[PDB]
Each structure stands twice: as structure tokens, then as C-alpha cells.
Design an enzyme around this catalytic site. Sequence first.
Site: not given
Lengths: 98, 595
Positions: B355, B485
Amino acid sequence: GGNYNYLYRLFRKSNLKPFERDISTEIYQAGSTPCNGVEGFNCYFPLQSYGFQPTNGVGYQPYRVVVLSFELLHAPATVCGPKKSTNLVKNKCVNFNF
Amino acid sequence: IEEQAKTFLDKFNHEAEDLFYQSSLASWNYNTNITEENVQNMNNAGDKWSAFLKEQSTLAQMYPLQEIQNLTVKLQLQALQQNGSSVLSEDKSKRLNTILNTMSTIYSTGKVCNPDNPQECLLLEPGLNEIMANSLDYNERLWAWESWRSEVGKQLRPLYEEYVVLKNEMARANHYEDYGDYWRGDYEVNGVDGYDYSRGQLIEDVEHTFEEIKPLYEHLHAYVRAKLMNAYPSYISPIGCLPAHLLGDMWGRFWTNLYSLTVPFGQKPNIDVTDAMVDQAWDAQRIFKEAEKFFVSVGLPNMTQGFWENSMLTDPGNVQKAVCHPTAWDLGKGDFRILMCTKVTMDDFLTAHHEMGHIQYDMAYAAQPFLLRNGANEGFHEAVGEIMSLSAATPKHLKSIGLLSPDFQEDNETEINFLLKQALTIVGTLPFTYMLEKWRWMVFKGEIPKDQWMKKWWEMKREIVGVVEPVPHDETYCDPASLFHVSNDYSFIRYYTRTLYQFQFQEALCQAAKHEGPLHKCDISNSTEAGQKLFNMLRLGKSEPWTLALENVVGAKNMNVRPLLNYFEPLFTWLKDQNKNSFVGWSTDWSPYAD
Ligand SMILES: *[C@@H]1O[C@H](CO)[C@@H](O[C@@H]2O[C@H](CO)[C@@H](O)[C@H](O)[C@H]2NC(C)=O)[C@H](O)[C@H]1NC(C)=O
Ligand SMILES: *[C@@H]1O[C@H](CO)[C@@H](O[C@@H]2O[C@H](CO)[C@@H](O)[C@H](O)[C@H]2NC(C)=O)[C@H](O)[C@H]1NC(C)=O
Ligand SMILES: *[C@@H]1O[C@H](CO)[C@@H](O[C@@H]2O[C@H](CO)[C@@H](O)[C@H](O)[C@H]2NC(C)=O)[C@H](O)[C@H]1NC(C)=O
Ligand SMILES: *[C@@H]1O[C@H](CO)[C@@H](O[C@@H]2O[C@H](CO)[C@@H](O)[C@H](O)[C@H]2NC(C)=O)[C@H](O)[C@H]1NC(C)=O
Ligand SMILES: *[C@@H]1O[C@H](CO)[C@@H](O[C@@H]2O[C@H](CO)[C@@H](O)[C@H](O)[C@H]2NC(C)=O)[C@H](O)[C@H]1NC(C)=O
Ligand SMILES: *[C@@H]1O[C@H](CO)[C@@H](O)[C@H](O)[C@H]1NC(C)=O
């Protein structure tokens, strides 16, 4: 919430002469079409405002600036540094400046 | 004229940066402290950003697009002039948003009830994902696989057929041939003297790179099949496909839950530094401060020092309702915050490096204009985050950062245990990703009519992936739409290209750091020349074509699969010796019901 009282000019016909100042507020005209004092495409208000906020990364926070400019026209004199005073003495051959 | 477009964008670039800021600042206060007086605080502040952008979008078509010469001001104009929706009739535009809301709430609130007790009912995320990831019962995994597709996926079949027609109308009004060509417009590059890329060229480069992974995937498919016959005897053929309900999750996307059945040497512990973190009293702050010392080791800037107060590195001392999900925020105005709820584990020691990699990518292109502050394509942003995590998980890096006995011995048996756990996630997901986007591309252009959707779907599973269904499915099912998705309108080719860019970046940085051994032992700490190779891409943004961004790191203009195979050659050598008495490949004729 943003301090919207600090503006800057972002459109002008021509760059400033040094130390020149321009507080007018005429509607800028980018394109060839005349503006007639109303906004629209290619007719922009010329002032924008920094919206400053306390959670802004550095380089986005307000800096205050002071520019000192010493000039020397052709007068007889004026302000200058401060003069120091060395302790005094006597009865002794000394090198003095009064 | 072109100089009027430059003056248009500079008024845009200073009204947008402020309106995007407080529309993203209000989304921070909802995400870290949930009330409903914050959800209403972010819905009106979110809609002022969206209503402003359609007003400047309809002002952008006053300027023509082919009367422009500068490449940068052309790139900003095309990203703003994009009509997207709104090209439809206003009653067809509200029909499309009704379908997208109905398909999204079926996936999140659909329940499956037990036939022995119809009063107990499971959702997908708590309870149905735990069966598919933990059970070893053949009959319970077969129940959870079939009942999710027959009770939820059958509701999405009449909704997905109307979704294809309305999305093809929106794409053909924007001068594409179908909606699949609309998704491939991210990789398009137009007229920059030798770096061009067509939207149909992406289809050949995916299929050309895939036929070099098929030797490696066949030996991984044969090894997992031989290990699954000991876990499920009398259920698996030694020359056939794998059954679709025994792969570790609901769709077989990742094979990462098959590690306890397929571990090469189970008497060697895979290296885990979590106990050495709680033996040295490492707080919440040490995990990021060692992460910041990794990035300053390579020649990248420090954190911005607003990063340390504004961020929320743990869930608070209050029992505070705040979506706990690792993420990296780029609110604007040079204000970067990380939101995660970190626990003292080597797992969150690694995702801290992941991150932070999104932040260092974000801090680099912050000097471009506003409409070019993304990754160069959709795949680069996650790929730069995962080469920070690969370099920090090596035992060479762990023993120099103080976490491994200076008397540690890495044996060749533990490198096989580590590489096989990587290949179940990396290599095991590549034929799933390639098959799914190939099916969706042929549905949009009309090569598959609607009476053969589920016929062509399961023929492509047996041929490309090597996976057979346990129960036959006619044209009342819609098995692609039972994935997140597909029913939530997302593109899926970004997961294929990110895997290929990730090892192209890592192999190009380890030649600059002067590595000597295998590629999977590499670490880019203490270098400066590798970081200078990385920083020359990070600062581009979208201002250059992405093919021009790749030559600044790799030295090529296209994605390449040879760095991915060099990472797995110690596994590919060991796999070819374990399959001397096995059969490599599969038959598309065998079925678990056809006897
Ligand atoms: C979540 O944030 C909101 C606003 O940031 C807090 O609600 C009020 O915030 C004002 C500050 O403008 C305080 O004067 C009030 O006292 C706050 N309300 C209450 C009921 O305390 C809210 O407190 C935050 N959530 C929590 C759990 O503290
Ligand atoms: C149009 O293209 C030119 C170069 O092709 C850009 O010119 C550069 O502009 C920056 C600041 O605007 C200067 O610091 C550079 O020295 C310029 N380069 C050259 C070679 O003169 C120009 O920025 C582009 N237009 C826009 C709006 O970005
Ligand atoms: C965007 O959609 C419009 C239709 O709503 C397309 O047609 C444009 O219509 C507007 C008037 O509403 C004209 O000002 C434009 O000249 C038309 N298009 C142009 C610029 O030729 C328009 O073609 C679409 N734009 C895109 C991105 O193709
Ligand atoms: C790890 O290295 C050892 C040391 O070479 C390997 O052991 C050798 O294995 C080969 C093939 O079975 C034998 O011919 C040698 O005689 C072994 N060496 C010794 C000293 O006995 C071992 O196979 C390697 N393991 C892996 C998984 O690669
Ligand atoms: C890589 O960087 C680390 C961090 O600066 C270096 O670690 C230092 O190593 C020396 C001797 O090995 C110790 O005396 C220092 O205390 C270490 N520093 C820290 C902050 O722990 C390491 O030496 C570097 N590697 C190389 C090859 O130079
Ligand atoms: C980064 O911060 C450390 C202290 O936190 C400082 O010693 C170091 O010099 C900084 N890096 C640069 C390039 O100034």
C-alpha cells in the site's frame, strides 16, 4: 472548509512590467468573440481563489512573503544600518573615532 | 483554434482540483467514522462533483479534436470529451441503471437454503465462501457449487441478455463496433511516431503470450491432479479434466486454497516471521517506519509528514464503525493518506509495503495536469504495488532488517515450497482470466448467439482451462454472471496484463541492482541505480503512451512472457521430474457423470 478570501489573477493580456500593479476586474476575452461583460465560453472572470485548508500537503499551504527592495535615487542620504559604540577609555595613547 | 483550448483547460484545472478535494475529503470522513449524517454528507458533496463534470463535458465539444497539434492538450481533451452514457434515449438510460442495480443486489443478497433444513440459509460471503475454501467433503462442495448457480445465476440470465443489447447500443453510438472494443480502448495509442497500438492488437498479444505459458500450466495441472486423487479417490480421472467444485473457491479463479493438499515437503515449515515481531514489541508504527526505510533505501522520497497525523493506521481506540479495508487515498492538493487496520503479522507487514507503493506512485506524477494523474494504463497501478511486496518477502531482506537468525539456512526444499505457493495464485489464475475475457469479447461482437452461451462457455473450460462441470447446464443458467466482475460491470483483462508487467518490472530492476542468483531471491534494497530506473516511469502519469513508459524500465515496447517464465524455472525443472510416470494434458471427453 476552505479560506476563499485569498485570490490571484490567472488571465491577463500581457505580462506585467516590473513592480506594476493591476487590480482591475474586467471579464477576460480569450477567443475572438467579444464578451460584453457577461461570462461564457472564452469569456472568463479573471480571478481565482486559493481554497486553503488545514489538511493540505506542504506546497499547498499558505506562505507569507515580504520583498524588501532597497533603492538609491539621487538624494543626500537616508536610512541605514545601526552603528555600534565601543567602550571608552583615556589616559592611554589610543586610536579613536568620534 | 488551439490556443482557446489551452485557456479552457486551465480554468478546468483549478476548479476541478478543489471540487475533487472536498468530494474526496467527505468520502474519507464517512469511511473512517460511519454515521448516517456522514452518508448524507458525502452524497450531496459527491453529486456536486459529478454534476460539475457533465457541465464541462458538454462544453468540451465546442472545440474540435483533430485541429490540435500538441499531444498533451489533445490527451486531456479526449478524456474529457468522452460521452460514455447519455448517448442513449433517456428512457433507455434509466432502464440500464435499473438492470445494473438489480444484478448488483441479487449477487449481494442472494441466499441458498439447505434441503435438510429449509430454515437455515447462507449468503455467499459468510458461509458459502467458507465451505468452498475449507471443506474436504465431496458431497458438500458439490451442493454449494450447484445451488449457487441454480438459485442465483438463473435470476441473472434474463437480466444479462438485456444488458448486452443496451451496452452495445451505447458503444456503437460512440463509434466502436461493440462493447468489447470499448473496453479495449484503454490500451489504444494514436500517432506518437513508432509507439502506436491498435485496439485489435491487444487480442493477438494476449493469445501470443498465452501459448508460451501452456507448457508451464500443463505440468502444474498434472501435478495438482495427481495430488487431488489422494484427497478424493474414486472421483478423479488420471487423464481427464479437474471437476469444477474441487478447486479451492467458488469459481476456480485462484488455486491458492489447494496448498495443504499439494504441498511438496510438508515436514518443512514455510518461513513465517510473526512470532519474531511480537517478541521485539513492534508497535503499529514500526511496520510503516521499516517500510519507509525500504523506499528511502532505493532513492525515493520520504513520506510527506502530513502522512503521519492524518492517516488512521489502526482501527481506533473507540469502538468506531469504520470500513476496515487496506487502501491508499490521493485526496488531492498533495495530501496522501493510507487507511488500514493493521495487526502485527507478516501478512500486514507485506501489504504495508504494497500500500505504500501506491503512495510513492501517486507522489511521483503529482506535477502533471489533473486529467493525467492516473497510471499509464489500468494495469500499471497494481503492478508497481506488488514488486514492492515481492522484494520484502525474501529471506535475504528479512535477515538484514532484523527478523531472522543470522544463522538461518535456506535449503532447496523450502524454495520449492515457496515457489509452488506462488504458482497456485499467479499461474493458476492466468487461464481463468484469459478464457473469461475471450468469452465476453465474443458475446459482445456476436460470434456466440444467445442459444449457445452456456454451450460455448463449458467447451472453453475443458479446452483452455482443463476444468469439467459436474452437472450439465442448459441455456437457463448463466454461470459467468455468478462472478462479481461480470454482474457488477467490470473489465477483467487488467488482471492478465498486470501479471505480465509485474515480472517485466522485477527482472529489469534486478539487472540494474546487479543480482547474481535466481530471480526469485532478488532484493532491490540499498541500490540507487534501480530506483532511478523506476522513477523515470513513475513520474509520467498518462502524459506519454504506455508503450513509451515500458521502454524506460524494461527496454521493450510490448508485454513479454519470458520474464514470468524465468521466475518459475526452478519449479518447472522440478515439476518435469515429478511427472515422469504421469500423463501431461487432459481429455475433453471425460465427465464425472458420463458413466
Ligand atoms: C463522526 O464525525 C462527526 C463529524 O465529524 C461527529 O459528529 C459531531 O461532530 C461535531 C464537530 O463538528 C461535534 O461538535 C459533535 O459533538 C459531534 N456529534 C456527537 C454526537 O458527538 C461524530 O462525533 C463522529 N463520530 C464519533 C463516534 O465520534
Ligand atoms: C505544448 O508542447 C510544448 C512542447 O512540445 C510544451 O512546452 C514546454 O512547456 C513547459 C511549461 O509549459 C516548459 O517548461 C518547457 O520548456 C516547454 N518545452 C519546450 C521544448 O519549449 C507545452 O507545455 C505544451 N503545452 C501544454 C499546455 O502543456
Ligand atoms: C456525443 O454525443 C453527441 C450526441 O448527443 C454526438 O453528436 C453531437 O451533438 C452535439 C449537439 O448535442 C453537437 O454539438 C456535436 O457536434 C455532435 N458531435 C460532434 C462533435 O460531431 C457527438 O458526436 C458525441 N461525441 C463523441 C465523443 O463522439
Ligand atoms: C537439494 O539438494 C540436494 C543436494 O544435491 C539434492 O540431493 C541430491 O539428489 C540427487 C537426485 O535425487 C542425487 O542423485 C544426489 O545424490 C543427492 N545428493 C546427495 C548429497 O545425496 C536434492 O535432490 C535437492 N532437492 C531438490 C528438491 O532439488
Ligand atoms: C543495506 O541497508 C541497511 C540499512 O542501512 C544496512 O544495514 C546496516 O548494516 C550495518 C552493518 O551490516 C550495521 O552496522 C547498521 O546498523 C545497519 N543499519 C541499520 C539501519 O540497521 C546494510 O548494511 C546495507 N547493505 C549493504 C550491503 O550495504
Ligand atoms: C527522510 O527522513 C529521515 C528522518 O525521518 C531523514 O534522516 C532523511 O534525511 C530524510 N530523507 C531525505 C532525503 O532528506
